[PDB]
A paper describes a structure:
Subclass B3 PBP (known as PBP3 in Escherichia coli and encoded by the ftsI gene) is active during cell division and localizes to a multiprotein complex termed the divisome, where it functions in PG synthesis in concert with the division-specific glycosyltransferase FtsW. PBP3 consists of three major domains: the N-terminal transmembrane helix anchors the protein in the cell membrane, while the C-terminal transpeptidase domain (TPd) is the catalytic module of PBP3 and mediates cross-linking of PG chains by ω-peptide linkages between d-Ala and meso-diaminopimelic acid (m-DAP) residues on opposing peptide chains. The catalytic serine acting as a nucleophile in the transpeptidation mechanism is also able to react with β-lactam antibiotics because of their structural similarity with the d-Ala-d-Ala motif; the resulting covalent intermediate, however, has a very long half-life (with turn-over constant k3 ~ 10−4 M−1s−1 or less), effectively leading to irreversible inactivation. AiCuris previously reported on the development of a novel monobactam (AIC499), which shows remarkable inhibitory activity against PBPs of Gram-negative bacteria, and good antibacterial activity, even against clinical isolates harboring several β-lactamase classes.
In addition to the apo structures, PaPBP3ΔTM was produced and crystallized in the presence of AIC499; crystals belonged to space group P 21 21 21 with two copies per asymmetric unit and yielded diffraction data extending to a resolution of 1.7 Å. For the complex with the E. coli protein, the AIC499 molecule is covalently associated with PaPBP3ΔTM via the catalytic serine (S294) side chain. In the active site environment, the β3-β4 loop as well as the β5-α11 loop appear quite flexible, despite the presence of the ligand, as evidenced by high B-factors and often discontinuous electron density. Nevertheless, we note that strands β3 and β4 clearly bend towards the active site, supporting some interactions of their side chains with the AIC499 molecule, most importantly R489 (see below). More importantly, helix α11 is N-terminally extended by more than one turn in both chains, which again allows additional contacts with the ligand. The terminal sulfate group (R2) is hydrogen bonded to the side chains of K484, S485, and T487 (the region of the third signature motif). The amino-thiazole (R4) is well stabilized, engaging in three hydrogen bonds with the side chain of E291 (specifically, one of its alternate conformations) and the backbone of R489. Unlike the situation in the EcPBP3ΔTM:AIC499 complex, the amino-thiazole does not form a parallel π-π stack with Y409 (equivalent to Y419 in EcPBP3) but a displaced T-stack. The carboxyl group of the linker (R5) forms hydrogen bonds to the guanidinium group of R489, and the phenyl ring of the head group (R1) is close to the aliphatic side chain of V333.
Residue numbers in the entry: 48 to 493, 500 to 529, 532 to 567
Write the structure that this text describes.
Amino acid sequence: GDARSVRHIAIPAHRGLITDRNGEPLAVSTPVTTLWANPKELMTAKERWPQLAAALGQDTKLFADRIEQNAEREFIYLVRGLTPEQGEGVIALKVPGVYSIEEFRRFYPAGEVVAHAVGFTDVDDRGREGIELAFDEWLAGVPGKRQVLKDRRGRVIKDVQVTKNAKPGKTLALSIDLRLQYLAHRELRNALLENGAKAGSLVIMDVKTGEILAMTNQPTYNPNNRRNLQPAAMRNRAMIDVFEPGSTVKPFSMSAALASGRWKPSDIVDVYPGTLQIGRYTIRDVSRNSRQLDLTGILIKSSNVGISKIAFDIGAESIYSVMQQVGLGQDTGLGFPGERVGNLPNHRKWPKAETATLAYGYGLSVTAIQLAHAYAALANDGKSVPLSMTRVDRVPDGVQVISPEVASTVQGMLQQVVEAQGGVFRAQVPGYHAAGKSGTARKVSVENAYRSLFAGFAPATDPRIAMVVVIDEPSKYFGGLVSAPVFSKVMAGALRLMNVPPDNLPTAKLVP
Ligand SMILES: *C(=O)[C@@H](NC(=O)/C(=N\O[C@@H](COc1ccc(C(=N)N[C@@H]2CCCNC2)cc1)C(=O)O)c1csc(N)n1)C(C)(C)NOS(=O)(=O)O
Ligand SMILES: [Cl-]
Ligand SMILES: [Cl-]
């Protein structure tokens, strides 16, 4: 039939390393040794089989069955992906017909801690989820090709000849700081356990560079062992899940009020009796023991009524404009697999009820990433630096989306939300002035179910990082009792890790 045969073999390309921003390995192509066999040669050395089988960790008779059943094939795999050292002891047995191929297997040194961001490759070493998928072309490289001239009995007579070399993939350095990532991962997980919550997300970003410094979710999974992996655990919820932001968008409503020319911080709004009726609907505050609140007090008490009255006065168009311009419900440009854009509703003419509900964050849907980016722009004196999941060496120009004077005023109000009497004191960061806003969003007709939110930034004197904590369905639940302490603990550790000077460790009690 055939005197010879020409078999073609690909030379595997070394897949690009993924590191965090400091060069810590997050995805590594590690060398592995695959053993294959020519059964026609192996069948001439049967008395070596029990020793070979032992070296492979395989049952003597099952190994023998496998060879005998494939006795005519010129090629079977004995085992793929042993360690180089395990392969080295088998090669030393010098069994006829047993040969080795070096290939690579992806290893994820941080495991579940950064699994949602990094993703993973399939058995064919192709990116399937996360960054591995999004940057697959960058990471993959260009494999080579060999030619093997084989026998009529499958024995490779002519030594392989290399057609094309293997071109390695490119290194990729993420924006993530693995130190902050571990801190965020451990504090979110502990908070979930303490609160009996179903899921959660935590985003940390650099307000000055747009970099995503940490992005963790629960549940998570071990990418190095995906046996019994369930779909819910795979979700990078910070990017691919949407939620109503509720009270956490009130600083943007307040930004529109101050940009309107119609409102100044010392203005007061009468929110008594803690409710406001619009047709058949009643807007309700949680704490309903207030009458006059100034604009800062409306944020401290989180008065839906107060922000609603302001929204009626200034018009929803101005609030829509700020929310759109800080990115809520807008494409982020990151291109993360499955990333959601959410929804910021718009109208030619805004009905009165929807003007109020926009202003306190009902009925729009955002991602944790978007909410964090919005807070980063506010923290950065109103200038939005573009998002990045990769290390930023040369920072692109930002876009001024809130005037610096309005941004600075709203920043001070959010510092009061954390530090003033009656505010979110469990969000305070010891040694630092922190600023932010809690939220609690009921999942309407979705039976005693809520999300607890906190969004903020620090240090208030020169903001460095913005943070969003989302805790999904705690079993207690308020934003200020559930997500606020997580913000405090993670913000304190992250500021320390970044060597940020404390701006609230005075040694003297000053007066005023
Ligand atoms: C802002 O986010 C805003 N939230 C809402 O109006 C929305 N839902 O509100 C839910 C009620 O939320 C709370 C109730 C009670 C408390 C609280 N501190 N008191 C106790 C805590 C322990 C349990 N017993 C009560 C805190 C929050 C609701 O209506 O069920 C909302 C907006 S969009 C959407 N889908 N839902 C409020 C709650 C006014 N401010 O939020 S904040 O986090 O408290 O600052
Ligand atoms: Cl609190
Ligand atoms: Cl509601």
